[PDB]
Amino acid sequence: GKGYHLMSFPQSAPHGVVFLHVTYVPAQEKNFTTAPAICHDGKAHFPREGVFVSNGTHWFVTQRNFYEPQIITTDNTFVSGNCDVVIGIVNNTVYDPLQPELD
Amino acid sequence: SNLLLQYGSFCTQLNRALTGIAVEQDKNTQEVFAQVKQIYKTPPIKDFG
Amino acid sequence: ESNKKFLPFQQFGRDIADTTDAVRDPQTLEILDITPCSFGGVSVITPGTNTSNQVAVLYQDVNCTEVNVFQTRAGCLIGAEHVNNSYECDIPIGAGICASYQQSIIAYTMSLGAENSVAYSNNSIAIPTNFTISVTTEILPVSMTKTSVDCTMYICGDSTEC
Amino acid sequence: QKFNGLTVLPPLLTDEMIAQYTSALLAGTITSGWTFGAGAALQIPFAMQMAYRFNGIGVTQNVLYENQKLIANQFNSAIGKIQDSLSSTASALGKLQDVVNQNAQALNTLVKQLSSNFGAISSVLNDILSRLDPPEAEVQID
Amino acid sequence: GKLQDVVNQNAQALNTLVKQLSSNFGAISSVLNDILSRLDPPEAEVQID
Numbered sequence A: 001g002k003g004y005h006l007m008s009f010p011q012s013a014p015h016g017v018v019f020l021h022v023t024y025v026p027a028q029e030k031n032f033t034t035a036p037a038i039c040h041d042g043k044a045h046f047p048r049e050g051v052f053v054s055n056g057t058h059w060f061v062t063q064r065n066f067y068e069p070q071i072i073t074t075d076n077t078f079v080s081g082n083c084d085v086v087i088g089i090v091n092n093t094v095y096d097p098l099q100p101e102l103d
Numbered sequence B: 001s002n003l004l005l006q007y008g009s010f011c012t013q014l015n016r017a018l019t020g021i022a023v024e025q026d027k028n029t030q031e032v033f034a035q036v037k038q039i040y041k042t043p044p045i046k047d048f049g
Numbered sequence C: 001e002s003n004k005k006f007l008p009f010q011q012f013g014r015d016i017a018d019t020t021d022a023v024r025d026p027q028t029l030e031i032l033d034i035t036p037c038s039f040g041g042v043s044v045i046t047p048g049t050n051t052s053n054q055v056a057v058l059y060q061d062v063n064c065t066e067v068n069v070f071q072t073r074a075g076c077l078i079g080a081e082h083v084n085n086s087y088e089c090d091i092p093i094g095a096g097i098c099a100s101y102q103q104s105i106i107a108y109t110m111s112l113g114a115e116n117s118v119a120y121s122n123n124s125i126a127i128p129t130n131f132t133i134s135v136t137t138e139i140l141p142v143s144m145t146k147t148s149v150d151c152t153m154y155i156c157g158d159s160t161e162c
Numbered sequence D: 001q002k003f004n005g006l007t008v009l010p011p012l013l014t015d016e017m018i019a020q021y022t023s024a025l026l027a028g029t030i031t032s033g034w035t036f037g038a039g040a041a042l043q044i045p046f047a048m049q050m051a052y053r054f055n056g057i058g059v060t061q062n063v064l065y066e067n068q069k070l071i072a073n074q075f076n077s078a079i080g081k082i083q084d085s086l087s088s089t090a091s092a093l094g095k096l097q098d099v100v101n102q103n104a105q106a107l108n109t110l111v112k113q114l115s116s117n118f119g120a121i122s123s124v125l126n127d128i129l130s131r132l133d134p135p136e137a138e139v140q141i142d
Numbered sequence E: 001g002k003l004q005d006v007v008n009q010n011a012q013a014l015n016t017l018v019k020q021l022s023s024n025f026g027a028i029s030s031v032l033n034d035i036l037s038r039l040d041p042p043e044a045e046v047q048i049d
């Protein structure tokens, strides 16, 4: 079928078979502005699974197939290198969750 | 041609088979290319990184 | 009136598969081409006896001067008013031309669909916020009717002398 | 190629409208990716579209970004050799020429059978009639 | 329509198979019990073939 497959059900027919394909069509898309990586504390941050999305002022991490924004932490990004080789990187603060417990 | 009709309907079958595959060659091109309902266009600015 | 160049001892020409093409008449030594009289099938375009009874007629690759006369690339279309629009339609004719019934039968050039210029920018994304469940069918034939035919009862049918 | 009772119908889709689909697919994948195989149209910058596609084959996306300049150059040169490999070869389209050479060749040998006796006095129909009489002509004709 | 075309082709081939039994094919008559009923054997053997 057309879309992302979920399941199918068979039905008989006089000299053939009939399938009922259950799928996805994602709908009601809203466009944002993105960035490939984020430079915080002099190192580049990439999303583990998802993308960096900006509403205009703030930056979040969402799934690529459904809008569910989350705060950018170190639990959903992985660091790789310094923020100089990536082109298109932006500036933002990565909320480390260990510091507030210690502080 | 008066003698030809004595062979029943051999002419009809031959014209039906050839017309039976003249249609498919139009169906084959449809299934391959015609998979988008909407004609997308590249933007005037081509900056793909 | 031909353009060929016969050597002055040759009478007639045969280009491919021994079909005569140019025959020089034996009185003015001029080469005259020969092309067969135009033929081709005749297709009747109907909108269904339920909706109406008007019909167009198409002549397969016959030039209209040799027969509401519209000269398509696929032949001569008689009875269909060629309009300057484009619709996705029902009756296919050929060379990108289709005809349909909308109080008359008229012809088009097929339109492949809507025009989209995706708002592509090098720092913007479009993420869905909702979804839909879509259930669709798919018909597939799996087998056809069994048949066994007796040769002798067919050819002869109870006649030992045959 | 109308010679003797033979017709060549035209294809329903002209080569101009076929070339409109393939430009509709090319303009689709390079501005969205796979999102048209599954519904509506969603933009994506081609730099991150390829970052999704390194994840698919098991390479972390930081490889692409740190090497985007090299990847673009390797891709641009790879297309450069595609045109050379076909515009100067012997026949890279040997699959398509075989289709053309079989329909034409199998049609010529259909025409060339029009000049065979099959056991009649002559291969031309109008000469059996002009030099014979009806009652036994039908034996030759059949 | 995909499953219908299968039935519409098989029942159509059979009908043209049966309709081919009622053609002279160049004999006196299309019925086999008439040639046998009005010719001697050494000349009916020609029409049967």
Ligand SMILES: *[C@@H]1O[C@H](CO)[C@@H](O[C@@H]2O[C@H](CO)[C@@H](O)[C@H](O)[C@H]2NC(C)=O)[C@H](O)[C@H]1NC(C)=O
Pocket (backbone or CB within 6 Å): A055, A056, A057, A058, A069
């Ligand atoms: C994106 O739109 C606005 C941009 O200001 C966001 O609204 C603010 O967001 C921050 C954190 O998200 C809050 O602390 C503020 O209280 C909000 N202020 C106002 C005036 O709205 C909004 O949160 C963002 N949208 C989503 C869905 O997160």
Ligand SMILES: *[C@@H]1O[C@H](CO)[C@@H](O[C@@H]2O[C@H](CO)[C@@H](O)[C@H](O)[C@H]2NC(C)=O)[C@H](O)[C@H]1NC(C)=O
Pocket (backbone or CB within 6 Å): A039, A090, A091
């Ligand atoms: C992102 O943050 C860093 C730090 O504020 C910025 O790096 C500075 O860039 C300017 C211009 O080249 C230099 O003069 C500074 O020396 C840099 N500071 C440091 C600590 O390295 C960077 O410009 C910011 N980028 C954006 C778009 O805001």
Ligand SMILES: *[C@@H]1O[C@H](CO)[C@@H](O[C@@H]2O[C@H](CO)[C@@H](O)[C@H](O)[C@H]2NC(C)=O)[C@H](O)[C@H]1NC(C)=O
Pocket (backbone or CB within 6 Å): C026, C027, C028
């Ligand atoms: C065959 O006969 C015709 C006439 O019957 C010839 O045509 C004449 O040719 C001369 C010289 O070219 C012209 O002056 C005349 O005007 C032509 N008369 C007519 C009626 O056409 C022709 O030349 C002869 N050709 C051969 C090979 O003998």
Ligand SMILES: *[C@@H]1O[C@H](CO)[C@@H](O[C@@H]2O[C@H](CO)[C@@H](O)[C@H](O)[C@H]2NC(C)=O)[C@H](O)[C@H]1NC(C)=O
Pocket (backbone or CB within 6 Å): A028, C129, C130, C131
């Ligand atoms: C996603 O789409 C569905 C419809 O397909 C929305 O469901 C409707 O929601 C409103 C109230 O929220 C109800 O009045 C309607 O009865 C629901 N069904 C229809 C057909 O309208 C749903 O709200 C959407 N969800 C989001 C987050 O946008």
Ligand SMILES: *[C@@H]1O[C@H](CO)[C@@H](O)[C@H](O)[C@H]1NC(C)=O
Pocket (backbone or CB within 6 Å): A087, A088, A089, B047, C122, C123
């Ligand atoms: C995007 O386009 C603009 C101008 O074409 C350019 O300045 C910028 O560097 C590009 N890349 C980004 C924002 O990542």
Ligand SMILES: *[C@@H]1O[C@H](CO)[C@@H](O)[C@H](O)[C@H]1NC(C)=O
Pocket (backbone or CB within 6 Å): C063, C064, C065, C071
């Ligand atoms: C044959 O058709 C073409 C256009 O389809 C036209 O130019 C030409 O006049 C026609 N030939 C004759 C003898 O009318």
Ligand SMILES: *[C@@H]1O[C@H](CO)[C@@H](O)[C@H](O)[C@H]1NC(C)=O
Pocket (backbone or CB within 6 Å): C082, C083, C084, C085
């Ligand atoms: C279609 O033919 C020309 C081409 O633009 C146009 O000027 C004309 O208005 C159209 N004719 C009709 C009947 O719509």
Ligand SMILES: *[C@@H]1O[C@H](CO)[C@@H](O)[C@H](O)[C@H]1NC(C)=O
Pocket (backbone or CB within 6 Å): A029, A030, A031, C119
């Ligand atoms: C972004 O918003 C809408 C989606 O609601 C989309 O149709 C539109 O084309 C986009 N606009 C721009 C400037 O990209």
